[PDB]
Design a protein around this ligand. Sequence first.
Ligand SMILES: [K+]
Ligand SMILES: [K+]
Ligand SMILES: [K+]
Ligand SMILES: [K+]
Ligand SMILES: [K+]
Ligand SMILES: [K+]
Lengths: 394, 392, 392, 394
Amino acid sequence: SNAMHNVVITAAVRSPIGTFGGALKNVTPVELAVPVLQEAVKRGGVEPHEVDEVILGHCIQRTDEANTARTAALAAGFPDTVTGYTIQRQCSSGMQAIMSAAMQIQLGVSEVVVAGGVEAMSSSPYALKQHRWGQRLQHGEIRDTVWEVLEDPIHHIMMGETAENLVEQYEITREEQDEVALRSHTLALKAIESGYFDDQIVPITIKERRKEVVFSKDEHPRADITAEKLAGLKPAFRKDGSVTAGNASGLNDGSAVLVLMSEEKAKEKGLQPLARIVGYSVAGVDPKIMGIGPAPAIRKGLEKVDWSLEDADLLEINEAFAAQYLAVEKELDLDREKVNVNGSGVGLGHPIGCTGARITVSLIHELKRRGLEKGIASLCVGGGIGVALFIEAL
Amino acid sequence: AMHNVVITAAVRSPIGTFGGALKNVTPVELAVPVLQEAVKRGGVEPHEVDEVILGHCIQRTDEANTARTAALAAGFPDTVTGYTIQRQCSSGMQAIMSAAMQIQLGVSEVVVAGGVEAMSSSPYALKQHRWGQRLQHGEIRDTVWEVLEDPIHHIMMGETAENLVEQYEITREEQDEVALRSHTLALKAIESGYFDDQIVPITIKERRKEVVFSKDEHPRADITAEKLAGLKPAFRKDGSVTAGNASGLNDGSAVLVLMSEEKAKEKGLQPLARIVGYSVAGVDPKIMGIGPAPAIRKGLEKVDWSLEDADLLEINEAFAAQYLAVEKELDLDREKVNVNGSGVGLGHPIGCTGARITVSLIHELKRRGLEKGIASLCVGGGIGVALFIEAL
Amino acid sequence: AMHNVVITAAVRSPIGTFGGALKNVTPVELAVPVLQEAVKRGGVEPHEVDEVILGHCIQRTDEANTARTAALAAGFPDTVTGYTIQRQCSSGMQAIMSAAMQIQLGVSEVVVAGGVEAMSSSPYALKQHRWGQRLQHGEIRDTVWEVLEDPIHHIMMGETAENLVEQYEITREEQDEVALRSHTLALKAIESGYFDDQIVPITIKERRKEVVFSKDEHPRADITAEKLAGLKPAFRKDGSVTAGNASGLNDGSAVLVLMSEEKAKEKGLQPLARIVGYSVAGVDPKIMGIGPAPAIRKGLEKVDWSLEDADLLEINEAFAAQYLAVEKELDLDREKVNVNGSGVGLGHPIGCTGARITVSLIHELKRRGLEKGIASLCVGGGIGVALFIEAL
Amino acid sequence: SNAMHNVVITAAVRSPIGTFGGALKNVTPVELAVPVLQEAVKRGGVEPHEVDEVILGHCIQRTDEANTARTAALAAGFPDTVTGYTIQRQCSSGMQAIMSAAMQIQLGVSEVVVAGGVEAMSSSPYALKQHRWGQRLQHGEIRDTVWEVLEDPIHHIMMGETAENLVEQYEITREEQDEVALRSHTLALKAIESGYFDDQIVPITIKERRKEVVFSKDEHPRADITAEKLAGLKPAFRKDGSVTAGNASGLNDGSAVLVLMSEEKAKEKGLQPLARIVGYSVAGVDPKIMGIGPAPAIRKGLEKVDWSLEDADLLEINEAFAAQYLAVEKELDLDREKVNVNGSGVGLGHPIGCTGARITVSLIHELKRRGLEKGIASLCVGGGIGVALFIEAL
Ligand SMILES: [K+]
Ligand SMILES: [K+]
Ligand SMILES: [K+]
Ligand SMILES: [K+]
Ligand SMILES: [K+]
Ligand SMILES: [K+]
């Protein structure tokens, strides 16, 4: 009679997503997480002291903000009792944070967990590898941590090259990629104008040197992205290639946070949750085609939760590259009309640590807006991993 | 679902000193041979491993996701996924706990979990290089020195130890007594061969040769009370915490193979130990060293043990003063604690240590023919973590 | 041998502010167009130039030997050799003196000489990168901030100015009076077109456009007594030296064509000026600003002038306080000194300035129809240099 | 009746030459100049207050020791009245310093000048060019100042490549280069053993962290350099090339200083000078074959002083590369038995700022040892310059 508690989600919020060198240029990951943590708890039906753990996914962790989760909890003014830990599973980090929170709740390790992800790519440092013991002679390299994290650590090829591998494998055309890219911006712009993201977005106040900036709207979507402009871009990873800056996701800044608790705890509190978690799955694939990860992850997960793919009402499949998304779409034979319905990574941006949580936030709110139930959120991961999360809106 | 968790292998590298044997080894490189040996001993083939989970404090973007990269570098199949955990000093212990959670829920059947830190090879960082320093001198930041500084209060871990010194009225002399004990017991354990079975030798390919690193290099054979008493305070002007009574900066990895009891029985394996419980407690970061006290008390309640039921404890010595605060607060029996030394004598490769002390505890329980163990450690940022095990 | 030295051209770039118009221009790039224009005006073809000598404070190993590299980059024949001089703030004036020495001895017949500084594009340095920092944080050093710090006493030039303030009992208010004058007279000179002939416009190729930089950008049209009086001391807590009464950090080049009087006559050229003498004096580095006093006195003896014989003087304002010490020590007639502004109003691109003030003095003597000029400046490290000229 | 004073040299001393990362690893240029300045003045027949100027040639100047000459004068304890300035003419910097001193003395600008050169290559810094205004994105370069100074700033080829240009032009063989290289070490070792350098060398005391090291002997010459070892080395600048690390000069540390004064001042003081300067010359050539500089410089200078080449009793022609030396030897048809008779740059090292002064120090002492009169010292210069100095031992 050992019990496994159902996991429900009582709040789901995010910062707007900044562009590289944009509104969040001078914000650290802890600074970017803090206001979102604060608003999540305010909406989530709990006081800070009731939070058992903060778990954050973070790709480019910083030693000056060791343990991003614990540091952000304290910086947010939460009691010293609110512990935290930080997760690195590359692009899926923010989704793994939610899964790890669910595990703690299912087991009764925690009753309430605040979980999500953050990435502040714009403020990420440069590194010197030979400074400690010396370069001795000849020129050295000062390494961009953002550019490093985009390079596979075993094969030393960029994520964009792994995308071109999928282009060749799945015979994906430049037109197909650019159609998806245009769609991503177009649907994002429409959602923004229609106010679809108003509820889920937490404005960030940036204290600059001589003023304060209130950042409240996603800044990656571009009205000037047209079929014409996309077709004129040069290939970014291979000569005679088709993956470009225009049909690839951006480098971006953002945070996203959910409040999760046992269903019994929500009943105790008299709270109507937004959604429940019904399952999650992780699958490993060839790092050289890491973008295909969501296919086996989704298949594995559907088997576990006893859904057909057709049962899903909406899906969020992160667009790391349009080509990568297209490979997943072709492999699973997805109905695009149910997928990324307000855009995805190409139009909205890809703050990597954040994204796995960001797409979950967006999915929850869009299911509710449409009055639909079943959602799948899934994304590829550098290093060759796919992760999928299965939810039901309440 | 709802499985019990057992441990079928528990191994570690020897612990290198800063700039020592492992000077030029990266965290992935240091994890790989220990991952391979653990799986070999743990009764499984690599394809049977569901997840590798590693605790790592100073993660590197050139080895993104240390656990997954190490799994691949170790030659494990692409199906063997991984993720990496940062809970500061307790990272390696949290990795074990996270593995246990997956196994308890039936998320995974077999998990390889532990921790690694390669402090000697950690980089330097420039924070103003991207957008420009503009004018005046800047700082090139040591990632090791950063990770030892509290990120909210901007004081070194050693200063948080001096806070405990003042709070618990701990003498310089008792700190040095504990430091001497740490080296002395470590040296005795090394001499007696207690660590022979748990240590995995590391081969380092140098310019003109290969070196085989097989023995812990931090313990000092000629350390003495007189030497310790002569040292200058390291963190406060009239202070008592010194380089001699503080843990070192060190390099090391440590790995366990965990699986469900069901899976062990199905494979006909006799596990070394089972996990009975685990607990985490948050405290004031300014006295982060006390973390193990509430964590242990919290965990004892959960597993329904009395403190006295424990046969052996490992409480990491981040600083002798910090250990002493815990000893005093819980009124521990020193003769059952850190019986073969701890961080001061053996070193503290931070990401690794939470797993390292668990490895050591498992093997010492077995050596003594004892059952119940507690492993626990403080965590920069104000956290205590505790793991409760029973040797089989 | 034993020739008289005349000057047939004297030109300069406009002076940019730090991070301003010349932000992305290197010293060679900034010297080139001014070298080319000087030679064009100076009555010679490039192949007739025997040597290019440039004063340069923050030399770069990627442009080794600034003078020779600039000569080549300017398209001058391979036969046109060069060398580069560091005598701190007086570097550009020393280049002129060294040119004169070569011409006097018949070592060279025609020399192009001057100075350059591109402070905005100067690099940062790491001193421990080669052999390693090992542990703890390091410094990434601003070469501009380094060059402004005395290398023996490790105090900023601004602090040496505060030493003169105390020594000569100079008020904050008189410093600000001089600072206001410097901007005011510079602005008037700019408005009246006094600098039109001497300035060589610089074209900067930016990402999407070309910019033509033709006017000095340091003078502040809206500077006032009230604004200056409100500023905080920059170098001492109860101090009087401020950012407003100190020279700026700036970018600029300045170049003269010199030759023997014999050579000028042979070429039928009418020179702008002749060099009558020059002098160098060493003083206490802690009050380096006073250098011009002994240098001027020493030189006056050599050329057999009285101070009163001078029609105009240029005494570089490194700091208003430093200028004031010189004015007081020599009992100068302010109405004959820095008549169109100086370093506070116009800027101080250090390698360039010793040549820049000479260019300016030559043209202002001519404009006023006056003969005798003295140009002089202080030098970090405790040196004063003075140049004595007669307009023709 | 304007007078031009004869220039005489009353002292000529040098540090031993350190190897890269060797005995002088942790010594700055000012530190390395100081003891040599001090000993020079002690031998030169003047008190420090009588010194009018210190002039030093220095290739890799440092902003933390601005104006190396003035800084070293003050650090040596010389009075504040002793001014100084620093010269950059690449490899000939140290020789130009002596020439500039001679000019001041000839003109009566100074009566006594201390002049020479210094280079501390081992302690030279690394530079970042994009740190001030930012790298923005992607990896950058941390630049070795030593490696930069060895690269031509117009053509961006290493000095070693300009040497290979001369190899091809003058049809110089690998054997010829290696014979010169072996000779350079062999003659240096012999001179050292015979005590030829005892008088001219000033020992340097290096204060290391836990001891003091007294460095008193040139450390570049190698007894293990053999014809066999040289022939086995790989080409360093061109595939199928012949310039190697073994037949090229090293990277080295050293200082060298002369005391110069008017002949009348020496007579006044009752001093017997070591030597007089009779002339000097500078010639510009193609930077791509900079190594040939000494040929036109020597020819130009001989015309000025009315010497035949045959009149010279000894020559020092710096060996930047054996190949470069060989081109000069072939062009001028030199008698090698009169040239570099105790070795040169390949065996002894090449601390670049120092070398032009170093070879002059060595020449003066060897002329005196052999009881000979006429000397020529000359060297090539990166950027395409040759410089020559003509002296008579007294
Ligand atoms: K919400
Ligand atoms: K084992
Ligand atoms: K976990
Ligand atoms: K002119
Ligand atoms: K000169
Ligand atoms: K001598």
